[PDB]
Structure formats: C-alpha cells, structure tokens
Scaffold this motif. Structure first.
Motif, PDB file in Angstrom:
ATOM      1  N   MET A  55       8.554 -12.068  26.396  1.00  0.00           N
ATOM      2  CA  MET A  55       9.173 -10.949  25.738  1.00  0.00           C
ATOM      3  C   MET A  55      10.572 -11.391  25.339  1.00  0.00           C
ATOM      4  O   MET A  55      11.382 -11.643  26.211  1.00  0.00           O
ATOM      5  N   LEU A  87       7.496  -0.961  24.479  1.00  0.00           N
ATOM      6  CA  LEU A  87       8.828  -0.389  24.366  1.00  0.00           C
ATOM      7  C   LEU A  87       9.838  -1.390  24.941  1.00  0.00           C
ATOM      8  O   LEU A  87       9.560  -2.000  26.025  1.00  0.00           O
ATOM      9  N   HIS A  88      10.983  -1.561  24.254  1.00  0.00           N
ATOM     10  CA  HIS A  88      12.058  -2.370  24.790  1.00  0.00           C
ATOM     11  C   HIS A  88      13.398  -1.670  24.582  1.00  0.00           C
ATOM     12  O   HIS A  88      13.505  -0.635  23.863  1.00  0.00           O
ATOM     13  N   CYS A 129      16.874  -6.802  28.495  1.00  0.00           N
ATOM     14  CA  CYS A 129      16.069  -5.594  28.347  1.00  0.00           C
ATOM     15  C   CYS A 129      15.918  -4.959  29.734  1.00  0.00           C
ATOM     16  O   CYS A 129      15.920  -5.682  30.734  1.00  0.00           O
ATOM     17  N   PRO A 131      13.735  -1.468  30.492  1.00  0.00           N
ATOM     18  CA  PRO A 131      13.100  -0.169  30.276  1.00  0.00           C
ATOM     19  C   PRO A 131      12.806   0.504  31.611  1.00  0.00           C
ATOM     20  O   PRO A 131      12.239  -0.115  32.499  1.00  0.00           O
ATOM     21  N   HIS A 138      10.246  -6.955  32.280  1.00  0.00           N
ATOM     22  CA  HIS A 138      10.799  -7.413  31.003  1.00  0.00           C
ATOM     23  C   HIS A 138      11.749  -8.587  31.224  1.00  0.00           C
ATOM     24  O   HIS A 138      11.700  -9.568  30.495  1.00  0.00           O
ATOM     25  N   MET A 143      13.232 -11.716  28.737  1.00  0.00           N
ATOM     26  CA  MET A 143      13.918 -10.850  27.785  1.00  0.00           C
ATOM     27  C   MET A 143      15.375 -10.645  28.185  1.00  0.00           C
ATOM     28  O   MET A 143      15.745  -9.573  28.662  1.00  0.00           O
TER      29      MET A 143
HETATM   30 CU    CU Z   1      11.685  -5.596  26.822  1.00  0.00          CU
END
Ligand code: CU
Ligand code: NO2
Ligand code: NO2
Ligand code: NO2
Ligand code: CU
Ligand code: CU
Ligand code: CU
Ligand code: CU
Ligand code: CU
Lengths: 333, 333, 333
Positions: A55, A87-88, A129, A131, A138, A143
C-alpha cells in the motif's frame, strides 16, 4: 492571509533520492504544494520472490521525502484512484491537529482531498496512512514516508555553526509481517479482506518476516547503491514508522546525528550507532574520509543480513593510509 | 536530625490522576509520608474478558504516582494485608542503597514496613516490586508505578527558563505475558504457585500478549479519556518498568521531553516520538494548540492498536485553520 | 611519519577487568600495539549446562577491552591459529574505512594479519568479527568486544569539569540464539557447517535463548562479583554488538552516562536506566554512596533474571541512614 503567500509546486522523486530544495530558505514562507497518488500494488520484497500487496504513496516503499522549511505551509493533494480497493488517509507527524491530518483526509477509491498544515517545528518526521481500525495494517504494508522541515537558516552543529550537506538520501526502513503457515511458509491471499485476520495475527507476533530498505531486500545495492565521493558531506534521513531501528554506517560514523530527528536540538557527535524509535525519523550527517564499499545497516545484524535491513554506499576517491592501512596483509603463520 | 523536619502526609489518587503538589517547593525539605496497601486482585485486561491475577500497589495498575521535591525524604508505609497470598517488596529507582529499598521492605501477608529514603536526584523514576527470585513475575503482573522528584524550583527548559504545567497525567504502560496453550488460547490457573512455571515460560518468549495503559485495553478512552483545553500546558509522565516504549501524541508533539526522565538534563525539543527504555519513566510537556480527539500511543502501532497501548485525549476549544485545514474535503474525482 | 611515533605494547586482560592505562594522556600520540588470538571453543553458558561453540577474541566473551587515546594509532595483530576451523576478521566501529577493518583482516585458520587505524573519535566503541555472508552468526557466537578511545584530557562532565574514575569495568552483554527443536530443547551439532542453517533459523526468530554478561549466566556473581568501596568512582563500559539493552544499577544510578558512548557529547545526568542500541558501547559513571550487594542488569527484567543479563557488585563501607533507612522493619499487623 495565506492567499497572499507564494505557492511553489514540488515535483517529487522516488526514494532514496530527494527532490530539489534549498537548505537555507531563499524566500519567505511559502505554500509548498505536493501531490501524491496512492497505489496499491504487488511488490516482490526478497530474493526468494515473496510477493506482497503493498500500500503505497506514489508507488514506492517508502513514500517520497517531502522537503519544506519551518513555517511554510504544506498543501498536499492526496489522490486515491478508483483502481485501488481500500480507504486510505494520511497522518503527518510534522502537523498539529486532527490526528496529524488523518481525520481530514479519508479518501475512498475514486476520491481525492487537499490538506494544508503549517510546518511549525523543524525536523525530519514520519508521515503514514492511519485509517481508524486498520492503522498498523496500512503502515506495515509500506504506507509511510517522511517529511523534512528544515530550519529557515539550514542545519547547525552543536555550537551553532552551519552544517551544509552536499548530498541527501532518504532511507525508509520497512518491517513487513508476511503471514506464515505452521510449517513456516508464507501464505498468499485472494483479497485484502480475506488477508486481514492473518495479517493481524502475523503482526501480533511482533516478529517481522522482512525488514528492508527502499522496499526490498538488496534495493540499495548494485546498480542502486548509494554513492558519494571522499570529502563529500552526506545527510542520511532514515525513517521507521512502526518499529525501532539502530542505523550504522559500516566503516564510518554519524558525525552529527539527530537520532530522534528534531533540529532545534544539538546533534549527538561521533555516533557509531543511534536509536531511531519506531514512529520516528532521524538524520545523520557524515563527511566521507575513505573510498570503497560501505554497508549501511540496522545494527541488529540479524535484521540487517538475514531479514534485509542493509544497503551499500560506493565511495570514490583516494585511500588515506594514515587513517587505516593493512600493515601486514593476511598470510600464513 | 530528620525528626526536626516538617512531616506532610500525602493522600494518593488513582492513575492517571496525580495527587496535589506544588511545582516550586513552598517549604524547605520535608519528610513526605505515603502509605500504600498491596492488593492482589483479579483484573479484566481486554475486550474479550481475559482475566489475570494482578499484583498491585493500592489496587491499580500502574500503582499511583508519588510526587516529592529533590532532597525531601520519602517515607513509605507499605502494607501487605493477610488477604494476599504472596511476599512483596518495593524498589524505588529514585533511591540509593539496599536494591532501591527492596532488600529492606520484604513483607509477607499480614506484615507491614516503613522505609525512608532521601530523594537526592530530580526526575521521574519507576518504582516496582522485586522479590528475589520472582522479580519479573511481580513486575509483569502490574506491580509497578512511578515517583516524580521535582527540582525544588520546578521544571526548566533547555535555556533555564521555567516550564510550568497546568495539568499532569501519569500513564503507566504494562506488558503482560498471559500464558497460552499450543493453539494460542490463554490459560488460567488455580493458584499463583501452579501458575508460576507457565508464567515464566510465557515471559521467556519475550512477546507480550497485552500492552496496556492504566491496566486494561481502552482504559484511557470514553468516559475515562484524558482531557485538556486548547492552550493548556500538560505534562504526561509515562513509565514502563520492564520493556521499551515509544510514546507519541497523535496530532501533537512532545514540545519538551525528558525521554529518560531526569530533569537536570535539558529536555529534547519538538519530539514526534521518544524512546523510554524498559525500567524507566519519562516525561513530555506539550501545550495543546488544536481541539478534538487525540490518541496517545506506543508508536509500535501493532502494540498500540492490536495489543492495547493506546489512550485518548479529548481537547476543548477553538480550531485553528492557520495551523491545519481541509482545503478540499474528500470527494470524488 | 608514523615510524617516528612512540610504540607501546598493551598486554590485555580478561573482562570485566581492563588493562592499565592513563585517563589523561601522559605522552603525545602513540602507536598502541595489541595482539589478539582468535579461539573457537566450547563454552557452558547457563546453569543447566548448555554448551555452545563460541567464537572468541582472546578466549573470552566478550573480547577484551582495548584502551587508547584520541588520535593514537591502534595496531592490532590478529592471529587465527590452525586449531580453529573458520575464517574470521575484525570490524572496529572506532575506525574509518574498509568496513571498519573487516575488509582488510580476513584470516583463514593458520593466518595472521596486522591492521592499523587512527582512533580519530573519542568514545567507547564495539569491535566485532564480520565475515561477509556470515556476520550475525559470528557476532552472536560471542565474537565481539569493545575499544575505549579516551579524550587526551580524560573525561569531562556536562559543564566541562573533569570526571576521573577510580575503577573501570567492562560488561559485555551477549545475546545467544541456541537452536531449539519443536519441543523447545536445545539442539547440538557435529560441525559448524551442519549447525549453520539451524543457527540462521534460530537468529531469524529474533528471540535470544540467553542474554548474558561476561559469557555465561551468573558470570559476574559470587567470587566474580564486581567490587567497589563507598565513595569510589566507577566507570562501567557496557557493549551490545547486536541487540538493544537497557542497563540499570539496582540501588544506584548512572550519575553521568554516555548512553551511546561518545565522549564529545555531554553525559546524561542521574539516569535510572539508559538505552544502549544494538551495535553500540555505552559508559556510565557512578560514585557509590551505600555498601552492600547491588545487581547490575538489563532492565528488561525477563532478560535479566530469566535469560541471564544480571551481575552483582559487592560494595564495602559504611551505611548512610540519612540516604536510606528501615524506619520500621517488616513485622506483623
Ligand atoms: Cu492506507
Ligand atoms: O559495523 N557494522 O557491523
Ligand atoms: O501518529 N501516530 O500514528
Ligand atoms: O531496579 N531494578 O530492578
Ligand atoms: Cu504516527
Ligand atoms: Cu510483588
Ligand atoms: Cu528496577
Ligand atoms: Cu569470526
Ligand atoms: Cu558493526
């Protein structure tokens, strides 16, 4: 009135390279505009061909290094194309409020958002990231990246004298938790939702399967080794968004190190190794004194040489026999 | 002659709150009297209802924060009621001699003792139980807290100017090692002696099953979230008696941090994340600049969001759009 | 012309003792000559009689502490006798170039070599074997020590005043990864080559089976406890070549600590516990104030009391009841 300020658009580059910038601010405060496009993609992370669903920010692990000056505004356009499935969002450790921006940047596939924050504190900082409910998944999927907020008068040593680097590199170090079966082989998954519980189980072991620089075992070696010349001053920014690391330049030092990355503090001098806590970026300044191959590692040497946390410098120039020499080369008794 | 000194009795409060004190000493040196009663009790530590046999000082995990000034005397009456089953003691990292007091405070159920020591070094320090031969078992059962020894002229920044907090909280972070069977489920035990070998086996994995603030997953959330107002100066004292942690205020910073907790040192400025070594208390000072929900975590985010090391602040006040704003809210391409 | 400089031959001693030296350099720069002989040998590392094939410098785990002054030259004759089976080398974190010397010191059994390097940075530093492709295996077999490069005017406190120690000890802390079978018992091996894959598997768990001081559980206890007198100033140099540690003097402090070991930095004052990153040497200065038994530990107390990372001081002198006293000895309610 932020609308009265200069805007400058940055065009990012792939780590370990860093986009063009000035150490000493050549303008007043600016709104510095960045755009990053989220890319979920398959990545091969080791020599065995182990393939994960990464990601990313802008297609890379780590995400690119963003560079501004203290009291600039960072304005990020974050794009989540409808080719992604999840979703990020983005949390900047450099920012103040709304979970670093994460509460304001939730983008579903097919959405974008633009966040602005004032970079009020100088330093290197993680961005990642985050979430709600799926944060470590993530982060440990790659990410995360970093942002450097330079003091407007550039870097200074412990006595307040200027430190100016000739070259900068960004080393992003990533702990991955590839799920294993009972026999110890990596599992693979049809969809992120089918992967999730096994991802959580693998994370909860707290034992990475891989710890890599720039997204893969050996990524900063061979034709992608870092380079320098003897006498060159090099800043290595190093981030780890989730786990401690202990960087070390094999054959060198950190002449000046901000181990926890914040430039209002005097740097630690002459470090062999320094601890960057998980969730932190740090920076080390070194002037090369000898040519040849160096390794740059996490000095848990298992993590370095077995799990992947090792890159190389190739340094050009003259050898200094005063500083080191083989008096008697290996030979038989 | 210590008998000529004022005595002041402190009445402790349950973490994360901290008993009333003065930052700047309003008297000369005092004998500061504390009483704590050891309580072995069952505690539910996660959302699944996992129940452990905790070993506490004063009924809580962590034990309460004790606050004195440098060169006060701490006089602790430590009570082990005959309703408990085990021998306990107390080691103060703030104290000098006799294993921090542990050699002088061994109390069987039905006994008490009174220890006095001079608090000769300013800082936040761990205190913990440490019975010879069973030390990590007591510590990792929750039997630890902290003591803050303030400089007599209160806290100072890196330039020697006063730092005065408006609010203080004590976050005790606890690694638990709940024994698991081969399938991975938690085991339960009839008596502490039947539990001991499996406790030792579980500790020797070095992998916590739970890492929690204030004794349980989610303990510092909801109606027990930490609170602050915009503009308020808050000190968060954080301890970890057995394992490293890396605290981070999501959406904020540590404006001034004593990562290893000792106030004769200048604080580190502008920290995103800081490393508190296992066996240490640290302290971070922050002035809130934005309202809303913050998370305060161990930034091994697996440890935070999967194993429990996450709490919340709820911050009241006005939102500053200069510092952060959503320029374009998430919307569709 | 290095040939015009004084040569001084050092005769090393076994840890935790340290060879004779002067804190303040009594001569100009010197070529300081050391000889170490590599010894592969069986070592019993725990109370159960677990026997490993250790890889040592000079017969000990850790290897001996080497002491020079800043801008001396270290000239090491490294001997690999034909009674050994493996290739070894040496990397000095104190040195600049050629992977710290590792690229220039590869010796097969029956060979020797002599390396010289300029000790340009003051501090305590790890040295370790590091053969390309087998680095963590050699390090985590015990093949590491430390070198102290003193400033030519000795040690200084945070204000620039002299710190002079009366006694110095070197605590080498070693993480071992003894391979286990599925049931959890240690395996043993006919040859290093038959051992290698299982050694690599055991390292990749990242979970030490043993963490010991001076090469074995209990090595710095009993008749080999460290000693001091009340009022004595003691420097404890502590190294960990592969994994973080968090030293703590139970009943004392680090009055002045260079946690990451480099003396151009001001020491941290009044530490309870400090983090020495894996791949680092650190040093702590303490003046004893109370007699009796102290424990010196890694304050992951599981690592200390279950896995071996604990030693003792026996301190002679008068007890100070002002600093600590039992007001009421343990007795029954
Ligand atoms: Cu993400
Ligand atoms: O000096 N690095 O192993
Ligand atoms: O910024 N905390 O994930
Ligand atoms: O104070 N050592 O547990
Ligand atoms: Cu974060
Ligand atoms: Cu206890
Ligand atoms: Cu302790
Ligand atoms: Cu070797
Ligand atoms: Cu090394």
């Amino acid at each position: 009135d932020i609308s009265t300020l200069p805007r400058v658009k940055v065009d990012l580059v792939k780590p370990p390279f860093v986009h063009a910038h000035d150490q000493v601010a050549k303008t007043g405060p600016r709104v510095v505009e960045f755009t990053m496009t989220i890319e979920e993609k398959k990545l091969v992370i080791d020599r065995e061909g182990t393939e994960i669903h990464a990601m990313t920010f802008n297609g890379s692990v780590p995400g690119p290094l963003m560079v501004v000056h203290e009291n600039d505004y960072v304005e990020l356009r974050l794009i989540n194309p409808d080719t992604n499935t999840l979703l990020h969002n983005i949390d900047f450790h450099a920012a103040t409020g709304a979970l670093g921006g994460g509460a304001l940047t939730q983008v579903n596939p097919g959405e974008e958002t633009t966040l602005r924050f004032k970079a009020t504190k100088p330093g290197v900082f993680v961005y990642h990231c985050a979430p709600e409910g799926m944060v470590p998944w993530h982060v440990t999927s790659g990410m995360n990246g970093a942002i450097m907020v330079l003091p407007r008068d550039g870097l200074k040593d412990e006595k307040g004298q200027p430190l100016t680097y000739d070259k900068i590199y960004y080393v992003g170090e990533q702990d991955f938790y590839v799920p294993k079966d009972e026999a110890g082989n990596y599992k693979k998954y049809e969809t992120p939702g089918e992967a999730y519980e096994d991802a959580v189980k693998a994370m909860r072991t707290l034992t990475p399967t891989h710890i890599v620089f720039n997204g893969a075992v050996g990524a900063l070696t061979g034709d992608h080794a870092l380079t320098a010349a003897v006498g060159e001053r090099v800043l290595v920014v190093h981030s780890q968004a989730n786990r401690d690391t202990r960087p070390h330049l094999i054959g060198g030092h950190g002449d000046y190190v901000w181990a926890t990355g914040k430039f209002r503090n005097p740097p630690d001098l002459d470090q062999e190794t320094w601890l960057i806590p998980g969730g932190t970026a740090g920076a080390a300044f070194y002037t090369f004194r000898q040519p040849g191959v160096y390794a740059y590692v996490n000095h848990n040497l298992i993590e370095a040489f077995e799990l992947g946390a090792a890159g190389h410098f190739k340094v050009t120039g003259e050898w200094n026999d005063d500083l080191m020499t083989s008096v008697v080369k290996p030979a038989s008794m």
